[model samples]
Target: MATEEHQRLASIVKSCHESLRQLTKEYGATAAWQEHTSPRNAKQLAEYAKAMKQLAAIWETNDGKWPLQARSRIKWAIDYITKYFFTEGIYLQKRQREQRLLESYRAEGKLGEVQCRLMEEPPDRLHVLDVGSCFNPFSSAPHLEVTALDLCPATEDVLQADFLKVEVVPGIREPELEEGSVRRLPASHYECVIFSLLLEAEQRLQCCLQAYDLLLPEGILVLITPDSAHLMKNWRYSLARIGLLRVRFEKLPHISCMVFRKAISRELSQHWASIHREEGMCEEIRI
Candidate 1:
């Protein structure tokens, strides 16, 4: 059963999506209208007509059909476009958020860092695993062989796989697993595992345990999620949103981005602990 607040938030989210759609339509139509150079070709003229029709349809159906979980994401996107797109600290802010997420491939430096990490080992011989592969083209970065897995429908490249039951092909041949299944698989097979923006939303600690299981002795698991503390503080501005806090609280609710790296085997984990003890993450992260 859906809550009253959820329904209301969904409606507000729908409205927000429609507003963005309108902006996209306006910009696309203007661009097409200015393409006077291609005016003489019949096929190009037909393309223009098709484009105009699409614009008309964009205006015709402004309904928002996002699922409950997706509503939160839409709210976040709308917030970013409205709040950060033209701000002074935009670049720094973008960097911070970009590193923890794989939603879009626009953050060059951050995405490059992930790719570099993957390529430190040979691509053809090693397999790369990505969890929460939501439209993350970074997983398919050309240098390393990447197999993207997800719990939801992303690009066709997204393999629907249960993290627990995941199987990475030995010796890398376009490595992939089924997407969206939640069963656990045997660990200690892959050299590296990646999980972006996962772990935080799930209630069970088993999620973490399973991640540990699926890793090889020295395997690396790169985990990313929202900093729940940061999000809670930022919520005060929810009132400044289109319908404000009243809508966000009543409709879409979510946590923040946090990240962690875990080694699967006890020996490997001990090595990580020793490094952290020497360098001291206490100086870096404030818990």
Candidate 2:
């Protein structure tokens, strides 16, 4: 299953991830991240762009994949969200389900204090933020109005910015671009924010918290990561505590797809997501 080009790209990605971890251990998370994103490290990121695209192209050509692939992940995400776009569809259904579940949780007194405010109105086209968007893959989706951002964009369709460092300002103002990079983004602007097979860093807590602020209520966040079962327990619990509800999950062999919705309230999701467990006796969220 290891083709020559595949091995080449895999080794590069694996090494980069290792380097990041080692750097984080040696220096600090901030220093390590700065070092990796520094001008001196531009070559590493440039090579990464080609490898990601070339490897994704290889996977796309194979109809009979040995396992999950990027194209599959993209296709699945698009298809799933397409239903959300149609007026008489899953968006309304999920909203209904959310209310029903929240009602039960409140009836049982699982949550003492929580607020559930229904969303304003259904959007015509979902405003999407494709973070770390190497090639702006979702640029063609008619149902999506994508603002693709990257640290190093392979194409012009993708804007230059680091999601980890960008400021999220209050209100629905457009992103401020200067010096050839994005500096600021509006809060509660996007209906969907996507992260597909990106790197890991210590500031992921802040990173995810930003994702919550950037999305509208009932909006979905799509995450595609390698590992048959990506350890999203912490990821799930962390986001759930902040009002993002984990509703859909896919455990593919090579890459798993997970989605969380920015629901009406933090209380609804905190307890609503807790019941999605395997007979756990933990009284409160620990992670």
Give one digit per residue, the lDDT tens place, for model 2 in 183-233.
Answer: 889988888889863546346666677888898878888888776222467
Best by TM-score: 2
Off by over 4 Å in 2: 1-70, 197-201, 228-230, 271-287
Clashing pairs in 2: none
Q: Backbone clashes per model, in order?
A: 25, 0
lDDT of each: 0.40, 0.67
lDDT of 1: 0.40
